[PDB]
Structure 1
Amino acid sequence: MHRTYSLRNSRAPTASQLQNPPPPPSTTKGRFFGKGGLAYSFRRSAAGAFGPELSRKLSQLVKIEKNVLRSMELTANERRDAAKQLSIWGLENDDDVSDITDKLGVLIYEVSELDDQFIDRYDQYRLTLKSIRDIEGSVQPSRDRKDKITDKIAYLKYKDPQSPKIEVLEQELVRAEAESLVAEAQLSNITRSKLRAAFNYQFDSIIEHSEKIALIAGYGKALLELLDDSPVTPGETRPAYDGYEASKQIIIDAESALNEWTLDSAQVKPT
C-alpha cells in the first residue's frame, strides 16, 4: 500500500526492489485512453440512470465486471496467436532452436486455455451478483409505497381532521408496515450468504489459476535450462544437437503434473 501510507505516488523500496532495481515504466503507455471507443462509457452510464434507485449501483458494477471479463478474452487470444507466430518463426533456424522454440510455444499455448475457464468462473460470479441486484430492485417498491401512504396520511390530516378517509388510510398504512416488516428481513437474509458464496468461488478460482500458471512457468524454465549456449569462433561447426528425448519427457511430466493437481493439494500455504 504505497498510496495509502505516503502522499507520494511512487513505489517505496522493498526486498524485491533492494535485490533488483525496478525497471523503467513502459514506453508504450499513451495519454489517450482508447478504451474501445465510447461504447464502454455508454454501457457504463446508461445502466446507472434507468432502473430503480435502490439497485442502480449493482447494475454499474455488473457492467464493469462484464467489461473486465471481456478484456481477458482478447488478451488470451492475442497471447495464443503470439505463441503460434513464435513457433512459426522458429522453424528456419538451427536444429536445437527449431525445437526449443516449438516446445516453448506449446507450453505458452495453455495460458489461454486456463484463461477460458477463469473467464467462465468469472461469468458465474457475475451472475451470482446479478441475482442480488435483481432481488433488491424488486424489494424497493414496497418501501416506496409505504412512504407514499405515510405522506398522504400526513397531508390529509393537516388538510382537515374531519375527513372519513383517516381510518381506511391508517389501516392501509398498518398493512403496508406489516408487509415491509417481513420484506426487509427477507431482503437482508440472502445478501450476506450470496455475497460470501460468490466471493469464495472467485477466490478459489483465482488461487487455482495462479498455481497452475506458476507450475507451468516453472516447468518451462526447467525445459529452457537444457538449451546449451557457447560462443563459436568463425569457421567452426557446432556439434550435432541430440536432446530430442529429454524435452518430450519434460513436457510429458508437465502434462502429468497439470492433470494430477487438485485444489486440496495446493502447494501455496498462506501463513
Structure 2
Amino acid sequence: MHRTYSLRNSRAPTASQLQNPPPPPSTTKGRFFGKGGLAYSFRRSAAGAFGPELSRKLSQLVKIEKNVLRSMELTANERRDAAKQLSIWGLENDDDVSDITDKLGVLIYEVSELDDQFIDRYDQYRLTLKSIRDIEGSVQPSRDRKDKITDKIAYLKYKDPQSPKIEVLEQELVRAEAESLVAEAQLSNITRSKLRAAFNYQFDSIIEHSEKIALIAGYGKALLELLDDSPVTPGETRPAYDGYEASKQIIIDAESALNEWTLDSAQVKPT
C-alpha cells in the first residue's frame, strides 16, 4: 500500500502520476452490493457457517479464490469477444486502418490466451491451497477430541475425584496430547512447505504473464507507430497503403519473442 501517514484515502503521486494527472474515476461504478449478485455470497456464507471452525477461514478463502477464477475466465472470454468484434468493426474502414485494427485484434487474442494460461496456473495454486485446507481441517479434530476429553476429565474430577474412570480418562488425555502436540508440529511443517511452494508457483506465473503482456504491449505500440496518423486535407485522394510487409514482420517478431521467452529470460530486476 502507498498511503503516507495521513488520514487521507489518497496516496502521494508516483513518477507516473507526476507525469500526467490521473484520469477521473470510472463512470461504470454503479450502486449495488458491490459484487453483482447473491448466490456466490450465499456460498461464501455457507463456507463461513457450516465448516469446522479452524478450517472455516481457509475454506472461505478457497471459495473466494474460485469466485476470482470464475470472474477472470469470464472477463478473458469477454475480452476475446471484444477484440474479435473490434476488428470486425475495423474491417469496413481504410485499408491501413483495417490492417492495424486486425493486428491489434490478434494481439488482444494473444493477451486473452496468455490470461487463460495464467488462469490455469492460478487454479493449480488454488488446488494446492485446497490441499493444505484439507490436511489442516482434518488435523483439527485431533485437538477437538483433546479439548473434549480434557473438559470431560475436569468435570469428572469435580464431580467424583475418586471415580474409577479418572485413570483411564487420564491415560486417554495423555494419548490425545501425544497425538496433538506433535500433530501441531507436523501441521506447521506442511503448512510452511505448501504455502511456500504454492506462492512461488503463483508468483512465477504472475511474472511470466506480466512480462509476456509487456512484450505484447511494446510490440503493439511499435506497430501503432506504423499507422499513418497524418490527416489528409479535405477533398484530396487517399495515399496508397504499403504497410502489409512491415506489420507482417512485426507480428512475426512478436510471435518469435513470445516463443523465446523463458523464466530466466525475464528482465525484471528487483532491488
Bin for the TM-score computed over the shorter chain:
over 0.9
- Mapped partners of 2:33, 2:168: distance in 1: 59
> Once the two structures are superposed, what CA deviation does each residue of 1:84-134 show, in whole Å capped at 9, x if it has no partner?
111111122222112111111111111110011111111111111111111
**Structure 2 equivalent of residue 139 of structure 1:** 139
- Residue 31 of structure 1: CA displacement? 1.9
Indicate if the aligned counterparts of 2:3 and 2:12 stay in contact, CA closer than 8 A: no
CA distance in 2 between counterparts of 1:167 and 1:135 reads 32
Residue 5 of structure 1, CA deviation: 2.7
Contact in 2 for aligned 1:73/1:119 (Cα 8 Å): yes
Instruction: Measure how far apart 1:14 and its partner are.
Output: 2.5
TM-fit CA distance, 1:240: 1.4
CA–CA separation in structure 2 for the residues paired with 1:68 and 1:135: 23
Residues 4 and 11 in structure 2, CA contact (< 8 A), matched pair in contact too: no
| Cα pair 2:84 2:105 within 8 Å, conserved | yes
1:187 Cα shift? 1.6
TM-score (norm 1): 0.95
Structure 1 residue 125 and structure 2 residue 125: aligned?
Answer: yes
User: Matches of 2:60 and 2:254 in 1, distance apart?
Assistant: 41
How many matched pairs? 271
Deviation (angstroms), 1:11: 3.4
Q: Structure 1 pair 239/150, CA: closer, same or farther in 2 (3 Å)?
A: closer
Shift in alpha-carbon separation, 1:238–1:135, aligned structure 2, 3 A: same
Distance 1:104 1:143 in 2: 58
State yes or no: 1:194 paired with 2:194. yes
The Cα shift of 1:2 comes to 4.0
1:226–1:177 CA distance, 2 compared to 1 (3 A): same
Aligned-residue RMSD, C-alpha: 1.5
Query: What's the TM-score, normalizing by structure 2?
Result: 0.95
Offset of residue 233 of structure 1: 2.4
> Is there any run of 5+ residues in structure 1 with no aligned partner, and where?
none
**Could you tell me whether the CA contact under 8 Å between 2:91 and 2:98 is conserved in 1?**
yes
The question of whether the paired residues in 2 share the 8 Å contact of 1:2 and 1:9 is answered with no
C-alpha displacement of 1:230: 2.2
Give me the identity figure in percent. 100
The 2-side partners of 1:231 and 1:186 are apart by: 71
Query: Structure 1 162/21 Cα, relative in aligned 2: closer, same or farther at 3 Å?
Result: closer
Q: Name the SS for the 2:226 alignment partner.
A: coil
Deviation, structure 1 residue 12 = 2.1
| Correspondence for 2:156 | 156
Tell me the CA shift for residue 58 of structure 1.
0.1
What CA distance in whole angstroms lies between the structure 1 residues aligned with 2:157 and 2:229? 94
For residues 13-68 of structure 1, what are the alpha-carbon distances to aligned partners after superposition, in whole Å with 9 as ceiling and x for unaligned?
A: 23222211111111121122463421121011001111211101000001111111
Work out the CA distance in 2 between the residues paired with 1:97 and 1:235.
Answer: 19
Deviation, 1:139, is 1.0
Change (3 A) 1:165 1:34: closer
8 A contact 2:100–2:224 mirrored in 1: yes
143-152 vs 242-251, which moves further: 143-152
